[PDB]
Write a protein that binds this ligand. Structure first.
Ligand SMILES: CO[C@H](C(=O)O)c1c(C)nc2ccc(Br)cc2c1-c1ccc(Cl)cc1
Ligand SMILES: [As]
Ligand SMILES: [As]
Length: 145
């Protein structure tokens, strides 16, 4: 539905740890990472990874103060990203999926990536049938032509 370069990034906490979660809005495609806590440095770093892989043009968050450090503003500068001073939830969705897999993995780390994998792969409710992972790549290839 939305612009191909729009992404959302937020932190959740689970087991005393921080999971950083990026959602490509138009597809539902998630990428995630477990960090020991929220620091500008971790946020910048994660943006740098995301941007070297997708065309990121704008990043929205539900917590703006997340993006106030020089550190974060530099990553966004260097990579050509912008936010927006204003404005789901999958975050319900991802945790849920985490909850089903937790026993299968020793470290939250692993269980999260398992949950990310299940989410990106799941077949669209019915018709169409594309998974979040298939749609991201469709949107981005389609928007290249
Ligand atoms: C992400 O960690 C950085 C690093 O390893 O050098 C870092 C770090 C850790 N601190 C910074 C403080 C001010 C400014 Br401007 C940039 C940074 C930077 C920084 C260096 C390069 C880029 Cl593209 C973005 C940020
Ligand atoms: As965050
Ligand atoms: As930014």
């Amino acid at each position: 539905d939305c612009s191909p370069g729009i992404w959302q990034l937020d932190c959740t906490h689970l087991e005393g740890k921080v999971i950083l979660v990026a959602v490509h809005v138009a597809s539902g495609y998630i990428e995630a990472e477990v960090i020991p806590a929220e620091t500008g440095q971790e946020t910048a770093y994660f943006l740098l990874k995301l941007a070297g892989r997708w065309p990121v043009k704008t990043v929205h968050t539900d917590n703006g103060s997340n993006f106030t450090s020089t550190t974060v503003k530099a990553a966004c500068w260097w990579a050509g990203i912008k936010q927006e001073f204003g404005i789901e939830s999958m975050n319900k969705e991802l945790k849920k999926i985490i909850g089903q897999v937790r026993d299968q993995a020793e470290h939250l780390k692993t269980a999260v990536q398992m949950a990310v994998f299940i989410h990106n792969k799941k077949r669209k409710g019915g018709i169409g049938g594309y998974s979040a992972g298939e749609r991201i790549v469709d949107i981005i290839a389609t928007d290249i032509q």
